[PDB]
Amino acid sequence: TTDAECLSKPAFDGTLSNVWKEGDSRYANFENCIYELSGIGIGYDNDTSWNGHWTPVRAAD
């Protein structure tokens, strides 16, 4: 499951969990891919769950 395959998956609005922070930005694993949060996002479960706009950026790892 490649970077190219992940990029081709649709963005969505919703909640991902086990979200982590690199620099200013937040990420989460989904469908063997990594999604990034943009827009206005709402956090919960100690900042590890985030609701908002998620866009695939690259493959897992």
Binding site: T15, R26, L37, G39, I40, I42, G52
Partner: protein
């Protein structure tokens, strides 16, 4: 209730979104805030926890003005009592 939590989050986001102006004017900027919610969905307090001064100010205004509805239930309220908010316009 997992869907209730997600739908309420989407209503917070929707509410703030509509009081948030010239969003794309801040493309590339970041701001993160923390709120204190009342059980009826009113904002008790909001503190900026870092980011672009100009985006943050707009974010603050958005949130203060937002008409956040009452949570579907006390359970959901508890989840968002102290929600962090991220503004990362595209």
């Amino acid at each position: 209730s997992g869907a209730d939590i997600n739908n309420y989050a989407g209503q917070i986001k929707s509410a703030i979104e509509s009081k948030f102006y010239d969003a794309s004017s801040y493309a590339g900027k970041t701001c993160t805030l923390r709120i204190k919610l009342a059980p009826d969905g009113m904002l008790l307090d909001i503190k900026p926890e870092g980011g672009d001064p100009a985006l943050c100010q707009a974010a603050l205004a958005a949130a203060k003005l937002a008409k956040i509805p009452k949570p579907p239930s006390q359970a959901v309220y508890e989840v968002f009592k102290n929600a962090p908010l991220d503004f990362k316009p595209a």
